[PDB]
Amino acid sequence: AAFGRATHAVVRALPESLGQHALRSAKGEEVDVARAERQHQLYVGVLGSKLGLQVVELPADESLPDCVFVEDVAVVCEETALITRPGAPSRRKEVDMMKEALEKLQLNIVEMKDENATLDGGDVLFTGREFFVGLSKRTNQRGAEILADTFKDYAVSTVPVADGLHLKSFCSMAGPNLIAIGSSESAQKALKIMQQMSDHRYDKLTVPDDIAANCIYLNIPNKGHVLLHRTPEEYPESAKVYEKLKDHMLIPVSMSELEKVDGLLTCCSVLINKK
């Protein structure tokens, strides 16, 4: 029942179409789909083969270029699964498959159907004590309200998010009561708001690179603290910070290709603790 404990991980293979057709906040360099596929395979390998989680691998759909980013279509807390209503309308076609996978895992399902509500799972940060929902271009007040009504056992606070970012584009949980946070003006502004609204102050792990603040924390049986973070090659100054977590099993995982389409570590999986 410790924070970060998971038994299952839902992921989805990336379609070949992702390279050219996936949505992306900024125009950048060409995506190497083969490399992206390899990095995704390694990512899944860490979750399942290395850490022992049971991985449910949903099939890619060439018509859904962004389907690999399952975090945005569902938010899971304990035995409840909130099927979201993505800010990008075309991505709402990804929802039904996740829903079916979560129902198979016996989770209590709540669907966001309100035509005036939108919410990307990537704008949701569950600290284990409460929820923080980013109000952005993808997630609106109504979506936040529905999430609050879905997880009545936890407090829900919203925080302004700018540009084409998501809340977790610059933060994520790095451990119990530990928030990994970027150093940019935006990241720090958001953190101060979250700290002020909460009934309890959180410890923080500040990294120089906002994107590198997105890591995956897991509490694994017979291993304890486990953390997947961006590599020294990708963000050396940030990797140096994670290296200071002497009680965590650090695992460097690359996402250099999917990062081109705003795909970070948390974005590629939905974690579940099925007892």
267 is catalytic: yes
Contact partners, residue 246, CB within 8 Å, separation at least 6: none
DSSP state of 210: G
Query: Is 85 annotated as belonging to a binding site?
Result: no
Which H or E run includes 86? none
- Report H helices in the chain: 18-21, 33-45, 95-104, 141-150, 185-197, 236-242
Among 67, 77, 267, 268, the active-site one is 267
**How many angstroms separate the CA atoms of 199 and 18, rounded?**
41
**How many angstroms separate the CA atoms of 109 and 111, rounded?**
7
Q: Which amino acid is at 1?
A: A
Q: Which amino acid is at 25?
A: S
Residue 146 near residue 117, CB atoms below 8 Å: yes
Residue 151 near residue 192, CB atoms below 8 Å: no
Contact partners, residue 83, CB within 8 Å, separation at least 6: 73, 74, 95, 98, 99, 102, 109, 110, 111, 112
Query: Is 123 annotated as belonging to a binding site?
Result: no
Query: Is 267 annotated as belonging to a binding site?
Result: yes
Among 166, 225, 229, 248, the active-site one is 166
Residue 11 near residue 182, CB atoms below 8 Å: no
Query: Is 38 annotated as belonging to a binding site?
Result: no
Query: Is 30 annotated as belonging to a binding site?
Result: no
171 is catalytic: no
Query: Is 35 annotated as belonging to a binding site?
Result: no
Q: Which of 127, 93, 117, 77 is nearest to 270 (CA)?
A: 77
Query: Is 37 annotated as belonging to a binding site?
Result: no
Which H or E run includes 249? strand 249-252
Query: Is 71 annotated as belonging to a binding site?
Result: yes
Which residues make up each annotated binding site? 23, 66, 71-72, 91, 138, 261, 267
Catalytic residues: 166, 267
Which residues make up each annotated binding site for Zn(2+)? 267
Which residues make up each annotated binding site for substrate? 23, 66, 71-72, 91, 138, 261
